[PDB]
Amino acid sequence: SKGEELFTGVVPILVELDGDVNGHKFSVSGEGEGDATYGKLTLKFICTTGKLPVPWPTLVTTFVQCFSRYPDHMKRHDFFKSAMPEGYVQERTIFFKDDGNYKTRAEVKFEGDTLVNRIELKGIDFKEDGNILGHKLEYNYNSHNVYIMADKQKNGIKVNFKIRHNIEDGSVQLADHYQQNTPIGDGPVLLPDNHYLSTQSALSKDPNEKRDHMVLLAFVTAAGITH
Amino acid sequence: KGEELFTGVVPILVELDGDVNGHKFSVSGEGEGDATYGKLTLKFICTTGKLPVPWPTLVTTFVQCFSRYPDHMKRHDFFKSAMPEGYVQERTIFFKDDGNYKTRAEVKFEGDTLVNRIELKGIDFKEDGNILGHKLEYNYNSHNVYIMADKQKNGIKVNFKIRHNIEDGSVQLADHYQQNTPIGDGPVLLPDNHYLSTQSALSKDPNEKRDHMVLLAFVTAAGITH
Amino acid sequence: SKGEELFTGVVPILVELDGDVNGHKFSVSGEGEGDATYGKLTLKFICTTGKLPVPWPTLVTTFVQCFSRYPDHMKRHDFFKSAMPEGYVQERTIFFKDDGNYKTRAEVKFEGDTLVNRIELKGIDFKEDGNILGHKLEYNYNSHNVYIMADKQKNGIKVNFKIRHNIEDGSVQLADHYQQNTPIGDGPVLLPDNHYLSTQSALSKDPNEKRDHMVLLAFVTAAGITH
Amino acid sequence: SKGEELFTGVVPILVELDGDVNGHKFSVSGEGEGDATYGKLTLKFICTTGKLPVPWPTLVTTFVQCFSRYPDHMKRHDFFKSAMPEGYVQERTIFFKDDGNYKTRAEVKFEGDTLVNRIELKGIDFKEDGNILGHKLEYNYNSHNVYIMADKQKNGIKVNFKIRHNIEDGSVQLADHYQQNTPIGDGPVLLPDNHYLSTQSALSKDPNEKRDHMVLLAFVTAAGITH
Amino acid sequence: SKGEELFTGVVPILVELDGDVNGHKFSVSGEGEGDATYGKLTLKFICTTGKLPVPWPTLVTTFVQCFSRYPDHMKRHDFFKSAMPEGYVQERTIFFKDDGNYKTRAEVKFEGDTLVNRIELKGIDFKEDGNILGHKLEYNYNSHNVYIMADKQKNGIKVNFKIRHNIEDGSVQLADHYQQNTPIGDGPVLLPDNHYLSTQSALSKDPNEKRDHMVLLAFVTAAGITH
Amino acid sequence: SKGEELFTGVVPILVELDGDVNGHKFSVSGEGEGDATYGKLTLKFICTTGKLPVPWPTLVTTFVQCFSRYPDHMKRHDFFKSAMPEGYVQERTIFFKDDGNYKTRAEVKFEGDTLVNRIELKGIDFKEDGNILGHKLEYNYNSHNVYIMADKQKNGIKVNFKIRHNIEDGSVQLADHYQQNTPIGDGPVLLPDNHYLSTQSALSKDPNEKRDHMVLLAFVTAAGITH
Amino acid sequence: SKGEELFTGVVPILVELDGDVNGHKFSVSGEGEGDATYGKLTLKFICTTGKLPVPWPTLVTTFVQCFSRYPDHMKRHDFFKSAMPEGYVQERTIFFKDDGNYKTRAEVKFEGDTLVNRIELKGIDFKEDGNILGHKLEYNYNSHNVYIMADKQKNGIKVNFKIRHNIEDGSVQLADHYQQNTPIGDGPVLLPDNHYLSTQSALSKDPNEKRDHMVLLAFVTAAGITH
Amino acid sequence: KGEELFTGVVPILVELDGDVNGHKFSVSGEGEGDATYGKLTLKFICTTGKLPVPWPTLVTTFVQCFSRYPDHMKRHDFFKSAMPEGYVQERTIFFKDDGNYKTRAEVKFEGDTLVNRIELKGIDFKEDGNILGHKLEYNYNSHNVYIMADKQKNGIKVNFKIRHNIEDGSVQLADHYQQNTPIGDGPVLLPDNHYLSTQSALSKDPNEKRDHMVLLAFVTAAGITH
């Protein structure tokens, strides 16, 4: 696609999130860069309002699937880059099993040469000492498959997957992700055949950062089509 | 529990009553399945005369309980978990730039036989199109079948898109929208997202005079390592 | 390659095997056809000397990897078809764990319009009541991955895999295959990057056939490369 | 295996390399940690002798496959951890297409609580303005599959793969790796069935480091067995 | 060992070599017999492709150490016979000082009643008028000690020695041999304590043979252990 | 060599060892003299920290192969003396079968008129009541051959032998020695052809010595070369 | 010695024996060549009077120790070459245990460019169906050490050794050799320190020889002195 | 049988009465031997004052039963086979360009002690020579000792040549002609030809005031593999 050509090199990224979970308001700013040729993202996030009222790992999926590596044989199935530079709207509901949910709306688009992800997040019905508000999630992340299908009627895609968050007591907290993406602009986009994205994420800390933060490195690669 | 019913070879019966643009037909099928290998062998006969649509368009309609689920994925096999009482399988199949089939099937054990009984209604097909005009080649491609849980119906939703090769080198797409729900009250396994990789071989019985199809299938689950 | 073009349609196949296992001599003829477009083979084999003295499943791998389906994005890695029409020599040693071995040499080439596989097999050091000579293998077949690497110095490939043959008592008999393929002709061939073939095999009987025989249907598909 | 238990949490790593390429002597020290539960490694390497005389990417593979993530259903095929704590010797020849070669010998073993990789490297026959000694490689890294087979007769494994190194003009420099691994200790070790490791590597710089160095983050996951 | 029994009398030997030195292709066939009771071998070799492109003495070591005489008090240290009848793989690099090198791989095993040595040889980097390709070696052969050590970690032995080849001007061409031997079979084999083989070789011609050939008589005796 | 001339008479020797075996720290000082003309050494060792925590015989090989007698016809093969006065580094790993290992590093060099051997030894993975830490070795010593080969790439030698330590119950404890020696200085050294040293060692006690000590007399003679 | 220089190349040999054992008269002629540089002899012997009345192996020692290889460090101890060209007289008594004896006198000397060994042999007191006259010796030969000492009073040497002749029933026939050698000429000869000669002999047949004969290849090397 | 007497450490006593060119002297020696290692430790004292010849000339005179015979050569150990009753050892030792020693010794067990009692007569030595002039260095070379059977005396003959280094860099040779015969009537082992490899270390006791020699010896049989 024409939007594909915008990602042949390193692209700076900005992320902005305004959140409210059970009435706890917070903001996070992020910055870094992405290199879609390698399916690679590096980002640092800072909670600019103080301490984050939810565990950092619960927000990883919310904080730019346009950086996925689509192998050459699958390039016609990359909806995300096709919607650029005008961008897309990404909406999710994230159901934490036996706990509350996040609802998010994001616009992902170029502002000049920068890929910007601007998100509003609302979380409701969390338990005060559940795994989320009780901060019982480990600072780690598993690998996942993200399943994509076309939604022709909305000129976009429907995406579903279930994140497994490790708990400090050896158990797992599930987070079921229902997602839809729709183009912001009116130009042609690529609607894909069913496929998935294989994801890997490394969470870390900046040793010289005193603010509540998260350093994130991700690799994402599309797979599942040979026709 | 339902798993135990598939450790060996299981006989299969298939019965389809169809109506496509008013053309009424019936097909009977028989054979056997071996879920240990994800393998099916089936022979289908049109008992009403000539089949008014191409045999390949009906392959998906004519028992995903015979899929091989490798040991590490056994908690994700909905299809067997619903046995012996069975499941209802419903689809809409949209043929791009042409009509659609709508199917409803019950798949369950009748005695020691796994039986697939189907009703099929096809509408809005073009008389000159790929389907009624019989322009599909007698072959079949390999596909991935994507499965998700539908927790509120206590079943699954399934989606995939069949690519049917046309006699001129083009491809006719058949977009499948599928739902399966248990017939009985027993517990079933609701899976994490995954897919089935499918391969199908179509052939003819050289001594069969009636309009028919011999089908061999291999189906294997994949996509989960957690 | 140019050889690739010989496989765009249905191609007739002939197979001829001259065998000697522990001194028991036998011959098998096979015929059928292959459709590389779908990675599909259909063959029927007859023991023309009487009872086959080894189990049919032990000979499946011996009885035309040129019929593998290579997806379009892997087509420069198909050695097998690139060697045609002149063909290739396929040599194996097959080590049956805790038992004897087969050594095979085969020429696979076009003879007119027909792909012909002519094989000589010698088996030695088999146990008179082990799984092979005691006919304790079930008449079935598992799915395998066949690992392929280039062997530049021999202008061919090196291939390795281990067949799992189910035994009648619920155990498995392994058969470790060491394989080499080298072109017969002097024309250039395609030497592949590392990849594998995913194989499925269905064994059955012809209800009209009174001789000792095996009907085989195979699907074979290359995978493992996206660069 | 028993060795597997040594890798359930974060394990400190030290790396020491003594190298000589076309008579250019150099030493690199590395340190960091691995979390085999996630198939994740984080390492920083410093050339302690001055400027590295070869490109940092050509040394990535030389600089602890015991940190690979083996999924539960493949844990019987993890040779690397089963050899611990006594370790294994890893030997390679790396052939750079149209250029010279590296030969390496490394001992990877626990020394106290730390997993130590001590390497000797000798490179010969490099072109003085080839892609390697002329520093023409990009500071980036592709994803690869690493193919592993047992070599029971030699009490170890054989490993083969071909690194694709991106070159500054858009071409690729191939680096064909021939690798053998052998236990150091006498205890029982697992010899695997054929499989592969899927690798991803992120190279970066430490903004506070004035010496010649490389920061490396890797993810490695085992795949290819369902039996 | 059990294999030792196979060598109590005269054993027929066949040797086949396929070689390529600096691109010069050649084949040699050999035949004769060994009497390990006396540490004695008698062999005749013929170059079946015409003139041998290297001197016959440089191939003496390549052309069945299972015929060595081990005195009664050292019979626990005879790896070579203990690997029979299934055999061993013998791999060498032979470095000719100031010239090129041979790399060989050979399987030495019984095929029926005959001990067969099947070899592939590749030589590279030879000087076109060096001592080897310029045929400057005398048709004679010195006595040598062949030093054997166990390599238990690799299920075999390591062997090293340096042949002194007399040159037509009175000097000597050194040929440094690095050798590894590994059992082919899975049964138990003897791994020896350190010792050596004392070798003597007599080269001659068959007065009735018009082709390029070598007649070889060898005596080999194990020594160096009294514990 | 020039170093050879430093050994024509009686030379004073000093030995200093800093040891740690399973965390038990200890130190040994030795003194005496060597007469390389006769291949003879006389040394007395004292544990200056109290009781030696390992048996004295296990340290014999650790406590100056420059005193070996090389017959006149083998004098160009004496690496040890050729490295003097600047000296050589001697490193070993000594593997006690079914028990732990010693790793040693020693500098052997002239300090004024005295040949000094300074050693650091680290032992690990010893069994608390195995033959070593349980003091089950007899106070005696067998005769051994020490196998020497050149290691041209390290400008030194590689050495291997296996000590047989008699145990109090009539059994033997093996100690497999892997040894490397490399010159300290840059001057040329003599790199030998393969040969061995024949060693005899006599252990005794000084009847006037109350501390834990060992008196050692050694004879060492090179052999194996007549070319 | 001056006589040493006569043996630097290949020297033709003639042997003539007239024998009488228990009254059975026979003659043997032999011819071939020797290469003392390699300690190597090749000879063919024919019984010119018909069938040999004693086994061929009993005469091997009787049928030119001047062809021994004396290593450079032992050259002053080679009496045999020192007595040339005038030669020496070799006298033996050979006692066959539990049987008769041979007494021999030989002159070994140059006649022109040929080294000639002319022998008279008388055998007495053999049993008619002992191992010798009964022809119960196997056609093979073991390796031996030949022990040499000076006999100053006779200006020559005294030699002793005991040949082990294998019998067809698995036993051994001993032949105790008492030998003296004295110079024929009056020029200076080298009288040796005690040493020995290590011997190896291969007996064979000429396939195109119809007469009763023996083909003999020998290797002899002096050893035992390093001073 | 005699073999069994040497499996452990055995105490040794040596007594020599000598007369060299009329100079009478006596030496007593003691220590122990360990034939398992071929190893001897001995201390000798001249009890009559100064030894009138160099200590190194007497080393060979001052118990080859302590030689190590490796297991494969055990049928060739005459010396042990003659124990406990013992053997007579006689030698003539010819010092090149000088005099000779003639010795006769009995070597046998006396109780649990192996005792070597020797008579030594030396004649025709030069007063200014290497021996009486004391010009031999206090050291010793390694030698091979050649043994043959003497079937008709039911013993052995032994020959070798000692090289004694002189204070000026030259060497004094001492050619040994030796014969051993059993004292008792018991059977002995008559060996095939072989040799003993010898090493000797001479030293002084720093507290001993009398004229003396401390000797450590290693002796190993070799030369037979049949």
Side-chain angles (χ1 to χ4, degrees), chain A residues 24-44:
Chain A
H24 301 56
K25 295 188 154 49
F26 58 99
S27 298
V28 173
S29 294
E31 60 190 308
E33 67 193 26
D35 201 349
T37 295
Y38 305 99
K40 185 169 76 277
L41 290 174
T42 50
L43 290 165
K44 185 180 168 186

Side-chain angles (χ1 to χ4, degrees), chain H residues 104-180:
Chain H
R104 168 185 185 79
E106 295 207 335
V107 180
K108 68 188 174 282
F109 274 86
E110 297 178 20
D112 290 311
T113 297
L114 188 287
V115 186
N116 184 196
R117 300 174 182 290
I118 312 134
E119 287 188 32
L120 182 149
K121 183 62 200 117
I123 64 170
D124 293 315
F125 286 91
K126 295 173 183 166
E127 270 297 348
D128 56 284
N130 295 146
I131 289 86
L132 296 179
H134 287 277
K135 312 178 179 183
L136 305 219
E137 296 183 340
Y138 194 72
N139 52 41
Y140 218 86
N141 294 297
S142 183
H143 302 94
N144 291 153
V145 173
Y146 294 85
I147 297 175
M148 305 174 25
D150 195 343
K151 198 167 66 143
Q152 308 279 42
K153 285 164 190 101
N154 211 28
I156 57 171
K157 278 173 68 47
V158 183
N159 177 253
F160 55 94
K161 191 184 303 166
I162 298 291
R163 295 174 310 271
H164 293 292
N165 298 343
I166 302 311
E167 74 198 337
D168 70 354
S170 67
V171 168
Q172 165 69 247
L173 303 167
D175 202 357
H176 289 48
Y177 291 87
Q178 166 186 338
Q179 278 180 269
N180 297 241

Side-chain angles (χ1 to χ4, degrees), chain B residues 9-42:
Chain B
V9 177
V10 179
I12 301 170
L13 248 22
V14 184
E15 301 291 350
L16 172 303
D17 273 331
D19 176 337
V20 177
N21 277 215
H23 298 117
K24 300 233 172 235
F25 61 100
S26 302
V27 175
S28 289
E30 50 84 17
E32 65 189 26
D34 205 349
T36 299
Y37 310 97
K39 182 187 83 212
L40 286 178
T41 51
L42 291 173

Side-chain angles (χ1 to χ4, degrees), chain B residues 17-87:
Chain B
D17 273 331
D19 176 337
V20 177
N21 277 215
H23 298 117
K24 300 233 172 235
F25 61 100
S26 302
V27 175
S28 289
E30 50 84 17
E32 65 189 26
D34 205 349
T36 299
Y37 310 97
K39 182 187 83 212
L40 286 178
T41 51
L42 291 173
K43 184 179 176 194
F44 300 97
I45 303 305
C46 186
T47 57
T48 46
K50 285 289 140 129
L51 194 73
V53 296
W55 281 106
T57 71
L58 300 179
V59 165
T60 54
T61 299
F62 294 143
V63 286
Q64 292 171 322
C65 44
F66 289 100
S67 294
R68 180 188 166 238
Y69 275 73
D71 295 331
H72 72 267
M73 284 187 64
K74 271 175 175 349
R75 273 161 139 124
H76 301 95
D77 186 350
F78 168 83
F79 302 102
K80 296 183 195 55
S81 79
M83 292 307 159
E85 304 86 357
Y87 53 79

Side-chain angles (χ1 to χ4, degrees), chain C residues 125-176:
Chain C
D125 299 315
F126 282 94
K127 295 163 157 172
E128 280 310 310
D129 226 63
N131 292 142
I132 291 90
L133 292 179
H135 289 275
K136 314 192 169 163
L137 308 207
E138 299 185 336
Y139 195 76
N140 52 40
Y141 219 87
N142 290 307
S143 177
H144 298 73
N145 291 159
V146 169
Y147 278 30
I148 291 167
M149 52 211 352
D151 189 338
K152 163 88 199 177
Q153 287 9 101
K154 281 84 120 354
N155 201 37
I157 56 175
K158 270 177 78 63
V159 179
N160 180 258
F161 51 99
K162 192 150 63 181
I163 298 288
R164 294 173 306 271
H165 293 296
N166 296 344
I167 300 302
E168 61 184 353
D169 73 341
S171 67
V172 176
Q173 168 65 250
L174 305 171
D176 200 6

Side-chain angles (χ1 to χ4, degrees), chain H residues 208-224:
Chain H
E208 183 57 70
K209 297 183 191 300
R210 298 116 105 201
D211 195 12
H212 72 294
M213 168 172 76
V214 178
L215 170 69
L216 188 3
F218 283 106
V219 184
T220 303
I224 289 169

Side-chain angles (χ1 to χ4, degrees), chain D residues 170-197:
Chain D
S171 61
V172 167
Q173 169 66 243
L174 299 179
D176 206 0
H177 285 58
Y178 292 83
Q179 172 185 332
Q180 179 181 4
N181 291 244
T182 307
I184 289 181
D186 50 297
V189 303
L190 305 175
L191 298 182
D193 293 346
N194 291 356
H195 63 285
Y196 62 96
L197 308 180

